[PDB]
Structures are given as C-alpha cells and as structure tokens.
Design a binder for this molecule. Structure first.
Ligand SMILES: CC(=O)N1CCC[C@H]1C(=O)N[C@@H]1COC(=O)c2cccc(-c3ccc(C(=O)O)cc3)c2CSC[C@H](C(=O)N(C)C)NC1=O
Ligand SMILES: [Cl-]
Length: 285
C-alpha cells in the first residue's frame, strides 16, 4: 500500500506537519515534523525516500527563504538534511527524471528565478542545468516522456499561461503550446500521458478550472472543474486518480481534499486534512 504524504504548508505561519493519508482506509498518520517549518516547498519521492525541497519559513517575527533539501525515511520516521541548493527557492516546482531531482524556478526575496538545478542522491550534490526561457515562481512541474515541463507561474510582472519543455539529453528548453488560462500557483501533474493543470491564480481570482495537455495533438483542453477554487494547492496521482489537497481560495486556507476520476470526468471530496493549509509539498510512496 502507498500513502499520500503532505509536508509543510501555511496557516497563519509556515508549518512543520508531515502527515500521510491512506486512500484505502481513509486514515491520516501524524509523522515526524520537519526540522524547519516551510511553505511554498515541493515534495517528491526517490528510492522510497521523501524529499522536501525549498520553500520559505514565514513566522510572525521574520521570513526566511529556504535553499534546503531534507530527506524523510518512512522506515525510520526521521528527517535528515541533504546538500542545499545554490540559491533559496520559495514557490518552487520539482520534477524527477531517472532518480534525479530538478528544482525549477522559485523566488528569493526580490528575485524571480529562471535557473534550474539537478540533485544527484547517489553523490549528494546539486548542479545547475540550462535555465528556463522565462523566470517562473509558483511554477507547476511535470515529467512526461522523460522531458521536464514548466507550466505557468509568475515572472515578476505578469502571471503566465505559457509553458516550456526541458530536454535533459540536449540540455535545452523549448516553448510549448500555452494554456487557455493564466495560472500561477496551480497543481500540475501527469496522468495517463497527459499533463493536468488544476486551479491556481490568474491575477484576479483563484481558479477552480482544470485543463490537460495532449502531447499528440499539442492542445490544452478543459476537463471538469474542481468543487473549490484554490491556489497554492498540493497535487499528486494515486492509482489512476488525481488528488488535490488544500490551498487558498482568497480568504480561507482549505482542508478539502478532492479526487478526479478520469474515466467519469468527475471530482469528489474524499477526505479533509487535519487542518486547513496552503503551499504544501505532496508525494506518494
Ligand atoms: C502576500 C503573501 O504572499 N504573504 C504575506 C507574507 C506571507 C505570504 C503568505 O501569506 N503566503 C502564504 C503561503 O502560500 C504559499 O506557500 C504559496 C505557495 C506557492 C505559490 C503561491 C503563489 C504565489 C504567488 C502567486 C501569484 O501572486 O501569482 C500565486 C501563488 C503561494 C502564495 S498563495 C497566496 C496567499 C496570500 O497571498 N495570502 C495573503 C494568504 N499566501 C499564502 O497562503
Ligand atoms: Cl509565501
């Protein structure tokens, strides 16, 4: 059995929570807290280990952008620090190709990154790769066909509907078809050879619309929208379904967890998190 892990988040301040949901029985497990609270981080799994990458610790007495990479071992219930990134990256996007973690964009104070770096767990090292064509904070990242897609975000001036593709073998980025909607802080994931972009912020409101990119036709098509408008949501895929966790709807930090079934094109509320929060890092193992 696999669990959906949710790490960090924000509710009045950045959080340390690490909790795991079991879709088979609806139970939530309270696991060991992160050593440093963080929101706007991204989660991922490599070799059965959960990684929490970047983010920011917003505390009522000061904010700190994070360049940290922390590793959680489910067998020991222990977090261990890993080599930090070259720069702090809040509102980051993460993708895994061949057991290597790609940390994409994000912010560091007044800086909106276009830089991308790759982590090698076997060596415990980070190395910069080719930067994106566009600076992107709150970027959605998805791995499809061994290519890394960077979708939407905010470049410091405009929220984006554009998306680009990284070719690891060639070390280069290329623009792909832009989405129908401008989305910053959307949940981006891949399911059945399609990239889904759910929710986000279009510059005026949080979104409940969801669209998917078909690689064969290079088009984005809207599918059923979520029941709740949400930005800075967590997203993952489990047993052929998409799960969206928490987020912010413009006033409230959501506890709602929705599930998308692609066969019926429907969303449904499956559980609630123990408390409402936004900017969580999510992964399945
Ligand atoms: C104003 C502001 O951002 N805040 C004041 C200082 C602390 C900080 C604060 O409250 N952040 C917490 C955490 O949220 C994330 O982790 C988070 C994670 C990933 C992406 C994004 C994201 C960023 C920019 C845009 C875009 O503008 O295009 C869209 C999405 C966010 C921010 S979601 C907005 C919400 C907010 O503004 N208020 C006031 C509660 N922020 C949050 O939930
Ligand atoms: Cl933030």
């Amino acid at each position: 059995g696999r669990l959906i892990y949710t790490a960090g988040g924000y509710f009045r301040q950045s959080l340390s929570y690490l909790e795991a949901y079991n879709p088979s029985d609806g139970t939530w497990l309270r696991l060991a807290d992160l050593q440093v609270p963080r929101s706007g981080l991204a989660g991922c799994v490599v070799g059965g280990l959960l990684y929490a990458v970047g983010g920011r610790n917003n505390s009522p007495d000061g904010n700190t952008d994070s360049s940290a990479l922390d590793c959680y071992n489910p067998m020991t219930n222990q977090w261990s620090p890993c080599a930090p990134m070259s720069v702090p990256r809040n509102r980051i996007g993460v993708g895994v190709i061949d057991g290597h973690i790609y940390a994409v964009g994000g912010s560091h104070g007044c800086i909106h990154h276009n830089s991308v770096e790759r982590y090698e767990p076997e060596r415990d090292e980070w190395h910069l790769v080719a930067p994106m064509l566009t600076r992107r904070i709150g970027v959605g990242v998805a791995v499809l066909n061994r290519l890394l897609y960077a979708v939407g975000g905010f470049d410091g001036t405009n929220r984006l509907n554009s998306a680009e593709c990284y070719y690891p073998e060639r070390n280069e980025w290329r623009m792909i078809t832009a989405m129908n909607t401008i989305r910053s802080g959307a949940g981006v994931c891949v399911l059945h050879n399609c990239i889904y972009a759910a929710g986000g912020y279009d510059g005026q409101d949080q979104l409940n619309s969801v669209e998917r990119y078909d690689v064969a036709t290079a088009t984005w098509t809207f599918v059923a929208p979520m029941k709740h408008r949400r930005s800075a949501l967590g997203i993952t895929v489990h047993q052929g379904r998409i799960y969206v966790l928490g987020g912010y709807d413009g006033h409230t930090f959501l506890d709602s967890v929705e599930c998308y079934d692609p066969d019926t094109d429907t969303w449904s509320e499956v559980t609630r998190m123990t408390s409402g929060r936004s900017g969580v890092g999510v992964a399945v193992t």
